[PDB]
Design a protein around this ligand. Sequence first.
Ligand code: SF4
Ligand code: SF4
Lengths: 198, 57
Amino acid sequence: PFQSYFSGNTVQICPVGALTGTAYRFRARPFDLVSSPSVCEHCASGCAQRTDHRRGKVLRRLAGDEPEVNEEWNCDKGRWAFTYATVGDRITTPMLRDGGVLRPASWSEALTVAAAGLLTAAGSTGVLVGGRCTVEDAYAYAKFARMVLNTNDVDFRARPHSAEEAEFLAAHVAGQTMGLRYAELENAPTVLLAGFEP
Amino acid sequence: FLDALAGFAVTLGSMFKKPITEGYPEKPGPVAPRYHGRHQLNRYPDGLEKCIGCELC
Ligand code: SF4
Ligand code: SF4
């Protein structure tokens, strides 16, 4: 089989209906698609994309056009890994634990219970933020932890990690934005990959 | 001038003419052959649906 991780780009690059995405097949025509600019949420490349959805369901995600980031390319993940939110496991309402069972709860009840539990926890609280959150969401987690829970126990590393990693990120990454760009990888005479599989 | 009373002739004469109303619903009037009524999805003579789902409509 055509085994490329970028195989989906061949669908977007074909000037005719020769190569087509089997998922998008017969789902919609251009006129009924709501199309919005987007950024892939999967990995750190941050590709510009165009999310096309019909009747509230995402049908495809084209590569968009960002010469400074991804030009006009995707990986198959970003192009097609958008169904996670609609596999039926999505949480649709706030849930509360009672009698050992998790049951739907009103937003008011859930908020009140969570606030009571967190206040009763005083400063002995940890905040695992994960890596999925946007920059604003991560800022919200940090602000909540350090203002509301009055704790420094915030960590987005939902993966193997070390204190050395935290020190390195603080010293050499945080605050130092745009130090290296895709345009410079394209020109770097030598690139040394350490612990990284592009 | 009887001309100023011409209208009385029009209404009176039309009294003795057969009313021109169409008898809907019991005897509905004839719509034009080209009239734009209900859409209809047609089939081929063997029964297959003609609609190929192109969404051009
Ligand atoms: S399209 Fe692929 S390479 Fe680009 S950000 Fe998404 S997952 Fe990463
Ligand atoms: S335009 Fe296409 S989808 Fe619409 S009725 Fe005709 S064949 Fe079917």
